Design a protein around this nucleic acid. Structure first.
Ligand code: MG
Ligand code: MG
Ligand code: MG
Ligand code: MG
Ligand code: ZN
Lengths: 46, 289, 246, 295, 148, 153, 110, 166
RNA sequence: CCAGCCCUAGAACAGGGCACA
């Protein structure tokens, strides 16, 4: 089985690529917003 | 053009040798080879073993039913009347059966009088190993019985080889005495047991179980497996020594890679010590009583 | 340094050396068949009756004046020529030719069959193993027609005899690797052909040699091949488009 | 009856083999069929195939290995067709891949194949003392984020649900099953023999009956790969190893007035359409939800 | 050169000599000529010493073939199936008898280097050395720095 | 060291490179689709974009007039440049050209060749590598994810 | 500089069989879904490009035959049409090329 | 010269008895007097050794060597021969068992250097031999695992014997 | 994970980027 190489743009569609970009972008934004207040969640003893 | 004939003939010999190395021909029959005389070969086979056979008995034993069938097929293919002499070959089935029976009985009796502690299954396995296809075929091939056996399929498959060997045994039994045939068997079959082990041909499955059964028979309570010495426990190749103690008395000890294999080896050693087949046993007496 | 290659294989025949031959080409047989016998499409059912086939064959062989005059010319050219003793000899020649093709005896096959029958029966079989046999014959071979070609430029007469043969044969054509390719060796399948033997009458020796093998147009198709065959599509150029036939 | 699971597997395999031998002996001779290739790549191609012996997989082998690698489904002139199903008569064939313009049929076939694989894994990953019965393969469209399978467990297993460790174990079992290439064989049988083939699952018997009701000739499609036999609609993929990425998302216990059935959900992507890590995680998180579609 | 040639251990065919001795020479075939001056020694040997040797060794089939050949040869076929070919071209009767006695006393095995001049089956009488056969045991089998 | 550079060396030097790019740009303006070496086409892309930007700037702009006079060798292209290519590209900002790498040349050089083409030309469309249809498996799963995201809001 | 000794065949093989000099297998090969030929995933199909090149050569040959002068370039837009086609209202006012061959499948009307 | 790789294609085997396994078909082919170089052709031969015919043709289509088209033509001719002459169905069921490249008869020319010195320039020519076997491609040998290494090492430790002991 | 496109990274081979625009 000579499997070929595959990147993330090969199998996607014109209507799915921007959706994927937005779905990862807002995900990263929400993660950085949730990690924005570390002193109130569970800080280690200073 | 280099004038000469010695170089040319020697190079022809070299080319023949290279052709032999390249395409090996199938083995041809020694009888079909040019230099051959059947009566002389029979007499030489009789005289080389320091025995006094019977010529008719040997000619009866060295024929095979497959050879008879092949000759009958050739007769039917050629169209000649051969029912006068070809049907009177006296196939060696009865001689082979007599040889098998006498050899098995004599080997069983020899093993019983030599090792009294050998169980029934043990002596049966020993007899079957000494009369198996491999040992009998090796002995016959070393005695050149294969070359004198009149039979098709010159490879002479192991069943035909063993049948012919035991037919020779039966011919010896009918010609000479039973004691002489027993000495022949002792000299040409028991020699294959020199240096061999009991379990290599017995091939038991539960040595510890057989050992505890033998101890129950010999009125011994139970063996205890104990670690005597060890060389490394976390190494990649551990070495353990497991000993068997009956009433706090060491009866056998075995080394191994793991504890289970070491205990199996200790059980095997204890079984051999109980049955008497030990490396320090009496050598087999090869003498003339 | 000035060294060049040689031995350039080329095949070019020219009319000047083709016509400048000192000796004309001696042919042992003719090129092809002049008068092809067209059998009626009712033989498949007529062969079911024994006498209703023999009577029709005898009548058709007797009433054809061309066959009668050809037989008379063969008789007057060479004595000891009988029509009744011909079918057995033809059957034996056919069986011997098949056995020779089985045994790969090319010299005997050349003695039996002619120069126009040998290639068509040796080309695609020279590298295959065949196991042919003869089991039975349902209908005896029936001499249908006799023709004669007389070329007067050289005074050469060649007589051809057509014989309908209904045989029961078993064919098993293997391949050069040893695997079975065409059919089984134990199936006695029936076949019905027309063997056209040819003999040169001016020749003093005159051995009867098989020349042609005619099959009826209504004959059943041959047995299927054990393998699967793929027919490639039309190789089209880039500036060409495909046209689907209807 | 007192029958071990291995004994049931052996009996099913033996009966399927007997039916297959009967189907093969139904035709004593090897007839020649003339198959046209109505595909887009090589038009006008003709194949001289064997009746009930040659397969569209053999047709792809005749064409080129690229077809054997790409083409998953076959369209025999009016309908889908798996690769390992023998041809019947002369027809025309068109191959169908995953990246085609109308790959809906191939997607549904891959869905059914993954559902059957998950069902086999669930059936053979549980203990012997417990009873486990596969109901059917719920035909959910491609828009649904997962393929589901209905399983009825023992009465004593209606309390616990498989945890993350159990889901990972199921996924490992599915991956090990995929590792060994298993061909999917499809056979056309009758309900009269399917009933005695199964003989144990009342739900499977009812499913066979309701599928043969709509069939005027009482024709049931059985599918079998390796040692497992199951009935499902539509053809299947030729090979198992085509399923590259495979996960068991979660399970949903639905209760009815008769009994409760575990609805196991799985996600899968072939080797031709494998996705990225984040894409696979998002699709698995979507498959984590509930899927409800019966009619 | 040991590395260039083969090697084998000192073995005996069919454990010869243990129960009874068997002459390993099965057949001995001479091929000579009647008029060639090179076959003088072979001719004189066949005249004089073949009968005494045949009487001394009954278990060997002795073949003699006068044929139009130039080099007198001797082929010894043994019980193991080995075929040893030697040339007796222009050799005196004493040398012929010496070669015949040599071929008779040979065992038929290959004439190559023998690694061990001895071969004893089970040489482990009374025990074989192992790294624990001479070290004393401690109370309970404790390791050097192990506390119980 | 070749850090922070945008122009690649071609021809026999700077002036030879300018002349080669000028000839390539003239051929491109004349034929609306040409093919050359991959590096030459990648270099010509920006010059063609700038030439279209200058042509859209109007006819009376003498700067763009003399720029086209220098670049377009065949003077029968300047009226074409100002009255065909520039007018048809008004709403488009930078999507004027299309460059695609073709298979290597059949000659023994085996060079990396590309084809550049002005959009909206009167030529058969190149076999552009298109995306997969929305009916594919992964595209359908992504459409389902998108529908779920839209229903969540 | 001169070599001091002849390099043996063992070292010769160890040098000219190293994976650094062996031709690597390219795994980006795919088939063209249109015509069924072979192409790479980042390169246009050779067969389709050859078809387009032949058609473009024919179109340019005809449009150059229409212009009997070398420096006679069209001042307006150009449109190519095939047999069985008529210029519409959006196609009027432009230069027109007429081809006897039918419009192929890949060429869109637009 | 020598011509045996072509004569190897004319051997005939005895018929296979009923019950024996099917022997796969073998097809030998060769191209003589190629203008390419011996080593440069051997590189492509080693590249396409052991691979399937389909993947070999796929690689040769994109290979930039001049011998790529040569070997592709040779493989196409060999496949056509195996399909037509030999009884080998499923034209894509072949794999390259052996693919070698040897030298042939060269030509000598004078290559001038200067100062009245010269060199014997050798116009090279190479023969390309190929063997196609009907059947699936053989699997690639995987690297030896740690378990196999440990087993072989334990076996080598166990196969020891007390040398010069008896 | 490395098809392809860039790099203040680089002979080749390597390394870092290609979602906010
Ligand atoms: Mg000078
Ligand atoms: Mg030189
Ligand atoms: Mg020199
Ligand atoms: Mg990188
Ligand atoms: Zn294409």
């Amino acid at each position: 089985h000579g499997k070929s190489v595959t990147w993330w743009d090969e199998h996607l569609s014109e209507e799915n690529v921007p959706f994927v970009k937005q779905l990862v972008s807002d995900e990263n934004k929400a993660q950085l917003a949730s990690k924005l207040c570390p002193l109130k969640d569970e800080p280690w003893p200073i | 053009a280099k004038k000469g004939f010695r170089a040319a003939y020697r190079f022809q010999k070299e080319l023949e040798r290279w052709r032999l190395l390249r395409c090996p021909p199938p083995p041809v029959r020694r009888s079909e080879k040019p230099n051959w005389d059947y009566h002389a070969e029979i007499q030489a086979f009789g005289h080389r073993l320091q025995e006094t056979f019977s010529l008719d008995l040997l000619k009866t034993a060295f024929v095979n039913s497959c050879y008879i069938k092949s000759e009958e097929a050739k007769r039917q293919k050629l169209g000649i009347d051969k029912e006068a002499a070809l049907l009177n070959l006296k196939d060696n089935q009865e001689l082979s059966e007599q040889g098998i029976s006498f050899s098995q009985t004599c080997l069983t009796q020899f093993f019983e009088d030599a090792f009294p502690d050998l169980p029934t299954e043990g002596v049966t396995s020993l007899v079957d190993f000494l009369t198996s296809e491999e040992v009998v075929c090796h002995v016959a091939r070393n005695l050149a019985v294969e070359q004198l056996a009149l039979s098709a399929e010159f490879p002479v498959p192991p069943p035909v080889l063993r049948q012919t060997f035991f037919a020779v045994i039966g011919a010896l039994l009918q010609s000479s005495g039973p004691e002489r045939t027993a000495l022949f068997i002792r000299d040409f079959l028991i020699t294959q047991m020199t240096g061999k082990e009991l379990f290599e041909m017995w091939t038991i499955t539960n040595p510890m179980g057989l050992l505890v059964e033998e101890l129950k028979k010999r009125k011994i309570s139970a063996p205890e497996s104990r670690l005597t010495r060890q060389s490394g426990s976390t190494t990649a190749l551990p070495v353990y020594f497991v000993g068997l103690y009956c009433d706090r008395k060491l009866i056998a000890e075995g080394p191994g890679e793991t504890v289970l294999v070491a205990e199996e080896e200790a059980a095997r050693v204890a079984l051999r010590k109980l049955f008497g087949f030990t490396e320090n046993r009496r050598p087999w007496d090869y003498s003339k009583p | 340094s000035e060294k060049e290659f040689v031995e350039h294989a080329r095949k070019a025949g020219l009319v000047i050396p083709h016509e400048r031959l000192e000796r004309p080409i001696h042919l042992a047989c003719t090129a092809g068949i002049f008068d092809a016998y067209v059998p009626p499409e009712g033989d498949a059912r007529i062969s079911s009756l024994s006498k209703e086939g023999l009577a029709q064959r005898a009548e058709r062989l007797k009433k054809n004046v061309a066959s009668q005059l050809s037989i008379r010319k063969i008789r007057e050219s060479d004595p000891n020529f009988k029509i009744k003793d011909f079918p057995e000899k033809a059957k034996d020649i056919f069986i011997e030719a098949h056995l020779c093709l089985n045994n790969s005896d090319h010299d005997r096959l050349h003695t039996l069959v002619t120069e126009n029958c040998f290639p068509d029966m040796v080309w695609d079989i020279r590298y295959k193993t065949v196991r042919w046999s003869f089991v039975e014959s349902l209908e005896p071979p029936q001499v249908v027609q006799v023709r004669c070609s007389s070329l007067m430029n050289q005074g050469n007469i060649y007589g051809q005899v057509t014989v309908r043969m209904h045989t029961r044969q078993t064919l098993a054509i293997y391949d050069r690797f040893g695997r079975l390719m065409y059919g089984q060796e134990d199936v006695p399948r029936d076949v019905l052909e027309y063997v056209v033997f040819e003999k040169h009458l001016v020749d003093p020796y005159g051995s009867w040699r098989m020349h042609g093998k005619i099959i009826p147009p209504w004959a059943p198709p041959k047995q299927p091949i054990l393998k699967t065959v793929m027919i490639p599509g039309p190789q089209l150029k880039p500036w060409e488009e495909f046209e689907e036939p209807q | 009856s007192q029958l071990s699971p291995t004994e049931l597997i052996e009996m099913q395999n033996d009966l399927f083999n007997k039916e297959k031998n009967r189907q093969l002996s139904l035709t004593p001779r090897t007839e020649k069929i003339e198959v046209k290739h109505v595909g887009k790549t090589d038009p006008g191609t003709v194949f001289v195939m064997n009746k009930n012996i040659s397969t569209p997989y053999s047709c792809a082998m005749h064409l080129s290995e690229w077809y054997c690698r790409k083409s998953i489904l076959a369209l025999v002139d009016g309908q889908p067709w798996d690769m390992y199903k023998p041809l019947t008569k002369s027809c025309e064939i068109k191959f169908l891949t995953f990246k085609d313009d109308d790959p809906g049929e191939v997607n549904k076939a891959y869905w059914r194949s993954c559902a059957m694989m998950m069902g086999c894994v669930i059936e053979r990953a549980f203990k012997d003392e417990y009873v486990v019965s596969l109901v059917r393969a719920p035909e959910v469209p491609v828009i649904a984020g997962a393929f589901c399978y209905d399983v009825v467990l023992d009465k004593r297993l209606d309390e616990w649900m498989p945890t993350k460790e159990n889901l990972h174990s199921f996924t490992k079992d599915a991956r090990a099953l995929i590792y060994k290439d298993l061909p999917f064989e499809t056979l056309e049988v009758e309900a009269k023999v399917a009933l005695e083939i199964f003989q144990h699952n009342k739900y499977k018997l009812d499913f066979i009956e309701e599928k043969a009701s709509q069939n005027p000739e009482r024709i049931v499609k059985l599918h079998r790969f390796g040692d497992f036999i199951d009935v499902s609609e539509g053809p299947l993929i030729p090979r198992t190893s085509i399923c590259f990425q495979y996960e068991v998302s979660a399970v949903h216990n639905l209760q009815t007035q008769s009994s409760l059935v575990r609805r196991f959900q799985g996600l899968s992507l072939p080797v031709h359409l494998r996705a990225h890590f984040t894409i696979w995680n998002k699709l698995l998180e979507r498959s984590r939800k509930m899927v409800t579609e019966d009619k | 050169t040991a590395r260039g040639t083969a090697s084998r251990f000192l073995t005996s065919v069919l454990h010869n000599g243990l129960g009874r001795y068997v002459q390993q020479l099965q057949r001995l075939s001479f091929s000579l000529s009647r008029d060639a001056p090179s076959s003088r020694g072979a001719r004189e040997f066949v005249e004089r010493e073949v009968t005494d040797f045949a009487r001394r060794n009954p278990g060997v089939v002795i073949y003699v073939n006068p044929r139009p050949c130039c080099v007198p040869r001797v082929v010894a076929e043994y019980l193991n199936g080995a075929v040893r070919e030697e040339s007796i071209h222009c050799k005196s009767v004493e040398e012929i008898a010496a070669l015949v006695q040599k071929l008779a006393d040979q065992s038929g095995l290959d004439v190559i280097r023998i690694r061990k001049p001895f071969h004893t089956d089970s040489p482990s009488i009374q025990g074989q050395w192992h790294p624990f056969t001479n070290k004393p045991t401690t109370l309970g089998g404790l390791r050097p720095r192990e506390v119980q | 060291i070749s850090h922070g550079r945008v122009f690649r060396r071609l021809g026999l030097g700077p002036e030879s490179r300018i002349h080669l790019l000028q000839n390539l740009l003239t051929g491109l303006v004349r034929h609306e689709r040409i093919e050359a070496s991959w590096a030459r086409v990648d270099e010509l892309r920006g010059y063609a974009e700038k030439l279209i930007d200058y042509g859209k700037l109007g006819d009376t702009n003498e700067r763009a007039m003399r720029m086209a006079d220098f670049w377009l060798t065949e003077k029968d292209l300047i009226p074409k440049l100002f009255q065909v290519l520039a007018p048809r590209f008004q709403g488009q900002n930078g999507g004027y050209t299309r460059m695609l790498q073709i298979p290597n040349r059949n000659e023994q050089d085996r060079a990396k060749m590309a084809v550049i083409e002005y959009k909206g030309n009167c030529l058969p469309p190149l076999p552009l590598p298109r995306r997969d249809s929305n009916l594919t498996l992964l595209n359908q799963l992504l459409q389902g994810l998108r529908q779920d995201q839209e229903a969540s809001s | 500089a001169a070599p001091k000794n002849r390099r043996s065949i063992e070292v010769n093989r160890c040098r000219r069989r190293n994976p650094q000099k062996l031709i690597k297998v390219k795994n980006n090969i795919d088939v063209c879904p249109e015509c069924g030929h072979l192409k790479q995933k980042h390169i246009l199909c050779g067969y389709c490009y050859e078809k387009v090149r032949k058609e473009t050569a024919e179109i340019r040959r005809q449009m150059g035959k229409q212009e009997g002068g070398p420096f006679r370039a069209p001042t307006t837009e150009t449109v190519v049409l095939y047999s069985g086609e008529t210029p519409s209202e959006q196609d009027q006012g432009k230069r027109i090329i007429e081809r006897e061959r039918k419009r192929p499948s890949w060429f869109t009307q637009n | 010269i020598s011509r045996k790789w072509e004569k190897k294609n004319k051997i005939v085997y005895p018929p296979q008895l009923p019950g024996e396994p099917r022997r796969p078909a073998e097809i030998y082919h060769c191209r003589r007097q190629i203008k390419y170089s011996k080593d440069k052709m051997w590189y492509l031969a080693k590249l396409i050794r052991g691979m399937s015919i389909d993947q070999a043709l796929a690689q040769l289509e994109f290979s930039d060597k001049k011998g790529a088209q040569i070997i592709k033509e040779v493989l196409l001719e060999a496949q056509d021969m195996a399909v037509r002459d030999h009884n080998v169905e499923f034209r894509s069921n072949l794999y390259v068992a052996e693919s070698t490249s040897g030298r042939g008869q060269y030509l000598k020319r004078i290559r001038y250097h200067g100062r009245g010195r010269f060199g014997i320039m050798e116009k090279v020519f190479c023969h390309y031999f190929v063997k196609l076997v009907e059947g699936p491609p053989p699997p690639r040998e995987a690297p030896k695992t740690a378990v196999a290494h440990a087993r072989e090492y334990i076996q080598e430790l166990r196969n020891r014997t007390i040398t010069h002991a008896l």
